[PDB]
Amino acid sequence: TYDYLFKLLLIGDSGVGKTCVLFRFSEDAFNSTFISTIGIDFKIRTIELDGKRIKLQIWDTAGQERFRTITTAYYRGAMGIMLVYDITNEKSFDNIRNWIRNIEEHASADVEKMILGNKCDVNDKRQVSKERGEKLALDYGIKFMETSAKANINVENAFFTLARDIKAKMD
Amino acid sequence: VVGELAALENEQKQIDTRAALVEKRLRYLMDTGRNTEEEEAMAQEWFMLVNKKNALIRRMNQLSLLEKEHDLERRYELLNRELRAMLAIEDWQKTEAQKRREQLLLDELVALVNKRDALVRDLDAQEKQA
Ligand SMILES: Nc1nc2c(ncn2[C@@H]2O[C@H](COP(=O)(O)OP(=O)(O)NP(=O)(O)O)[C@@H](O)[C@H]2O)c(=O)[nH]1
Ligand SMILES: [Mg+2]
């Protein structure tokens, strides 16, 4: 027995931590090893939300351009997308604009979006200030959270938010 | 633990074998008016057998769906690990027969994810009912 079924999508450059964010949230696990995703995968975790049970189907995409075509094919089904960058990698942040393009070009017009600056545990190598992240997301009308899959910061928050936000279009 | 599934399928036919008899006996009365006491007793049990049968098919349906999932998951996991090892090799090093079979395997890995996604749509199918 479960009540709902939301399909979510993670996109962003290879290495920003999409799989770790998903694994944190799904398995409460974290791999330090970089094991690049091949094509596409998904996990399910059914959560207890607001007195109410919801099964989330979260699609994880390969960040490499080698699999770009494969991954884009999965955009139209998403009820919500995380655009992820790495706060320790300026270039991954610069690429957020391009990834916003593919969403608006291939997902549903009402798909709900959310930018995550991941690896916010790594202070000594921060290349993107939280203020630059927060104001970009304000600029796109997109919610913003800094996350750490490693430190388990705001991961549950991130998805629980995106899903209450989905639920809210119901109700 | 999948043996429970097979245990259930034999249970179901026993139910269906006994319901078979009961149904003909319950329809045997009624099409006559031969007895209407014994008859409600039969109607009592037929009804009992029917959603005993339905409870079981529902439990079987969820068990089968679970088995196919664990199967697909482990096939995915093993093919993923496999092609991680394959792609990790430089392309200048392999026959082309193998670069082309890597593409086939890649396509296979995608079909597996889609087969898994099919079961998800399938599972929430069976759950709109109760
Ligand atoms: N310090 C820190 N490292 C992290 C964090 N999230 C991920 N990493 C690390 O960054 C690397 C890449 O993570 P991964 O989840 O595989 O990235 P990805 O975006 O899925 N890559 P791809 O698109 O290639 O599949 C791993 O070594 C992982 O341990 C985090 O919050 N903090
Ligand atoms: Mg990945």
Numbering used by the authors:
A (entry chain A): 4 to 174
B (entry chain C): 1074 to 1203
From the article:
Since we were not able to obtain wild type bMERB:Rab8a crystals, we attempted to crystallize these mutant:Rab8a complexes, finally succeeding with the mutants of the full-length bMERBM1116A:Rab8a and bMERBF1120A:Rab8a. We were able to solve the structures of the bMERBM1116A:Rab8a and bMERBF1120A:Rab8a complexes to resolutions of 1.914 Å and 2.0 Å, respectively, as described in materials and methods. The complex structures are quite similar, and we describe the bMERBM1116A:Rab8a structure in detail. Two copies with an overall similar architecture of bMERBM1116A:Rab8a complex per asymmetric unit were observed. Similar to previously reported bMERB:Rab complex structures, the major interactions between Rab8a and bMERBEHBP1 involve α-helix 3, and some additional interaction surface is provided by residues from α-helix 2. Hydrophobic side chains of Rab8a switch I (I41 and I43) and switch II (F70, I73, and Y77) are buried in a hydrophobic core of the interface formed by α-helices 2–3 (Y1149, L1156, L1160, L1179, L1182, and V1183). A conserved triad of aromatic amino acids (F45, W62, and Y77) also forms hydrophobic interactions with V1186 and L8, F45, and I47 of Rab8a interact with V1193 of the bMERB domain. Several polar interactions were observed between Rab8a and the bMERB domain, including between side chains of T4Rab8a-E1200, Y5Rab8a-D1197, D44Rab8a-R1189, D44Rab8a-Y1149, Q60Rab8a-D1190, R69Rab8a-Q1176, Y77Rab8a-N1187, and the F45Rab8a backbone carbonyl forms a hydrogen bond with R1189 side chain. To unravel the structural basis for the release of the CH domain from the bMERB domain upon Rab8 binding, we superimposed the bMERBH1-2:CH complex structure with that of bMERBM1116A:Rab8a. The first two helices of the bMERB domain adopt the same conformation in both structures, while the third helix of the bMERB domain in the presence of Rab8 adopts a defined conformation which would infringe spatially on the CH domain binding site, suggesting that the CH:bMERB:Rab8 triple complex could not be formed because of a steric clash.
